[PDB]
Amino acid sequence: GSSGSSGSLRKERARSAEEPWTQNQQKLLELALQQYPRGSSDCWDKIARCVPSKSKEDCIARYKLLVSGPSSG
Numbered sequence: 001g002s003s004g005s006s007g008s009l010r011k012e013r014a015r016s017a018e019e020p021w022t023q024n025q026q027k028l029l030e031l032a033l034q035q036y037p038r039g040s041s042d043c044w045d046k047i048a049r050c051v052p053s054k055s056k057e058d059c060i061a062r063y064k065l066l067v068s069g070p071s072s073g
Contacts, residue, residue, distance in 0.1 A: 021062065025053045029062060 011017075021029070032047040048056035 019053075022053070025051050029054070029059055030066070032059075033063065033066070 028050040029047060032050045036043050036046045044059050045056045047059045048054060051059060054062070
C-alpha cells in the first residue's frame with residue numbers, strides 16, 4: 001500500500017503468533033471439549049489445562065474451526 005510505518009500486522013512464520021496443533025494438542029483439546037463443555041469463562045480455562053501448549057484463549061479460537069468443519073458420519 002502507501003509508504004507507512006504504523007498500521008496493521010502482517011503474517012510471518014518467524015513471529016509464530018498462531019502456532020499449529022500437534023496430534024497431541026489437537027487430541028488433549030477434543031477430549032477436553034467433552035469433559036468441559038460450554039458455560040462460564042472458567043469452563044474453557046480448564047480445557048487449556050489439558051493443553052500444555054495452547055492456552056484457554058487459543059482453545060476457543062480452535063473450537064470455531066472444530067465445529068466449523070465437515071465430518072462424515
